[PDB]
Design a protein around this nucleic acid. Structure first.
Lengths: 48, 145, 129, 98, 129, 49
RNA sequence: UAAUAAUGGUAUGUACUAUGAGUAUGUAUGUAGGUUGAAAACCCUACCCGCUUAGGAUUGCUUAGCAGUCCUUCCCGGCA
């Protein structure tokens, strides 16, 4: 007769990925043109 | 039991963090062994007739001591003896079966403990479906930004 | 089958329908006809208004209030008015479904419902090559 | 390790479709229907929905995101062979200007 | 085989479409969202108002589709305003085709465009039996 | 081969499983069995930029 | 408890206009009180709701993984 309970991690070093990793599809996304708001910042700084 | 505390549990919960930790129960493993008879040899024998009424009256009509099987014939197994047996003189001893201790049993079990890759992949896919739903819903936000 | 809706107030201009089971939902279709002269020829102008209003209670917050109480009901309204001359309903019918197909891409398929537009949408006019 | 991966940008419309012709003369989801020829479906709309499937499949690629549909409707599919390869953690190097 | 159009005015609120072939016809979409607490609980109300106008000159005197006989133009404007809670958008969508058919029954298939009205016309609601 | 569910919703008129691309005719997403698909065997490995 | 007001607001309906939701208007300003006046009741009290401040809750427990909250304070807003 054996009766006990255990809980184990998903060892995220090995497993834990295999997902979408929402970094991508957003880092390759507008991060450049949104950064390009340097144009507007320069505009406001000129009149500042 | 091997419990692990996460420190300021409630504080981290309010901060907005999900927490996991390995855990073990105070389980028990038992091994019980029951001895049995071990026949080694036999030789003497004898034939007994005595009585053959061990069985019940299934398939017979009961009328007092009469076991009616047909409308005109019956038998009384108290005296209806037609089965002959044999009885021998067996030689037997007490044999004690043996088994591994629960210590090494649990050691082997915990060594064999391995997560289910198929279940892991299926659950990851199940989560990723709704993850994609929300990502597709939210995709327009940085455009407004 | 969807539950039939029956009128409550009939008039030569306005007919207001409501569901017998729950009369809070309404569908008021008003009409407004005028005389318009443009090309030295009077034309029949109809300003057909249609207002469909449905009421569905709350967004139903989880737990807590899910025993015997309902947060006050909200209002869902879709208003449509159709103008133009009555001598050319045939083209008015054609553009209406085109308007129906046009609105669907933004609303039914696109995310305009949640409040975000889509400049890269693909809409077409009533006319055809 | 090996990884079953979906392969978009290599599809074709084989024309095996069977549109259904509703005998009810409306958008009724009941009543009788007749299988019709695929010639009725517009080429432009067919291409549009094909490209929609293309972009959805390309987005759902090398993700192991969804699985095979219970009804058989596939998605961007990635079946693992054996143990999946560990993914190295995204490292960070930081410098502060004094 | 339907000619598409392309945006004219781009704004965080309004997008103006228009046919390059025929600049008269246009379709624009503006929407305003409001931060509301109706039953002391927050709600996501988005009001998407849609206009589709076509200047189609079609008096076209009887059997006179013959020669260079130009007619003055007349207006055909279609105004739609959809406002409701974004959280209930899914069922708000479901109510929307009910508005489609309801208008279609009384007007597209009915005879409300001429300015007439039939109280006995089949009007149905969103919910089902 | 499989089918082409989740293809699109605009233009099509949805009647339960039925998607009416026209007033009278309709098509069904999981019955749209006219597409030829390639699925290939891939050996992959993470790389560090 | 409270008056002078600047009562530039908001929401919901009306008539005109509308390749516009613009114009003007009625109504009400989370829930009830005190109060002249400018009765669109200015303002204070009390009760709810949502912000903000920085502190906490058994912080660990669990033969399952919890839990997406709770209380106070700062706290500004739900007619000016």
């Amino acid at each position: 007769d054996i009766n006990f309970y255990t809980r184990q991690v998903i060892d995220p070093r090995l497993c834990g990925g295999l997902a979408f990793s929402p970094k991508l599809n957003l880092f390759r996304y507008l991060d450049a043109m949104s950064l390009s708001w340097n144009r507007s910042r320069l505009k406001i700084s000129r009149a500042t | 039991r091997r419990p692990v505390s996460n420190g300021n549990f409630q504080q981290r919960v309010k901060a907005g963090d999900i927490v996991v930790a390995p855990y073990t129960s105070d389980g028990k493993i038992t091994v019980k062994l029951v001895a049995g008879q071990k026949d080694i040899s036999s030789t003497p024998d004898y034939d007994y007739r005595i009585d053959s009424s061990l069985a019940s009256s299934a398939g017979f009509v009961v009328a007092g001591e009469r076991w009616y099987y047909t409308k005109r014939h019956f038998i009384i197994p108290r005296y209806f003896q037609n089965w002959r047996m044999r009885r021998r003189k067996y030689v037997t001893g007490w044999v004690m079966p043996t088994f591994y201790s629960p210590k090494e049993i649990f050691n082997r079990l915990k060594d064999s403990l391995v997560p289910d890759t198929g279940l892991v992949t299926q659950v990851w896919a199940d989560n990723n479906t709704k993850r994609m739903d929300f990502l597709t819903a939210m995709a327009e936000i940085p455009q407004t930004l | 089958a969807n539950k039939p809706m029956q009128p409550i107030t009939s008039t030569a201009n306005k007919i207001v329908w409501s569901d017998p089971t729950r009369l809070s939902t309404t569908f008021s279709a008003s009409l407004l006809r005028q005389r318009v002269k443009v090309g030295i020829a009077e034309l029949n102008n109809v300003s057909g208004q249609y207002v469909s209003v449905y009421k569905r209670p709350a967004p139903k917050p989880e737990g807590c209030a899910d025993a015997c109480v309902i947060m006050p009901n909200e209002n869902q309204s879709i208003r449509t008015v159709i103008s133009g001359s009555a001598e050319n309903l045939a083209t008015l019918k054609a553009e209406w479904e085109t308007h129906k197909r046009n609105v669907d891409t933004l609303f039914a398929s696109g995310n305009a419902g949640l409040g975000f537009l889509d400049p890269t949408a693909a809409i077409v006019s009533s006319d055809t090559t | 390790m090996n990884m079953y991966k979906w392969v978009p940008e290599s599809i074709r419309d084989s024309g095996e479709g069977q549109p259904s012709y509703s005998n009810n003369g409306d958008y009724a989801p009941s009543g009788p229907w007749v299988a019709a020829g695929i010639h009725t479906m517009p080429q432009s709309l067919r291409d549009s929905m094909r490209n929609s499937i293309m972009v959805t499949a390309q987005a759902r690629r090398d993700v192991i995101g969804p699985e095979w549909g219970p009804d058989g409707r596939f998605t961007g599919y990635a079946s693992v062979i054996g143990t999946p390869d560990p993914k190295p953690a995204d490292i960070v190097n930081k410098f502060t200007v004094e």
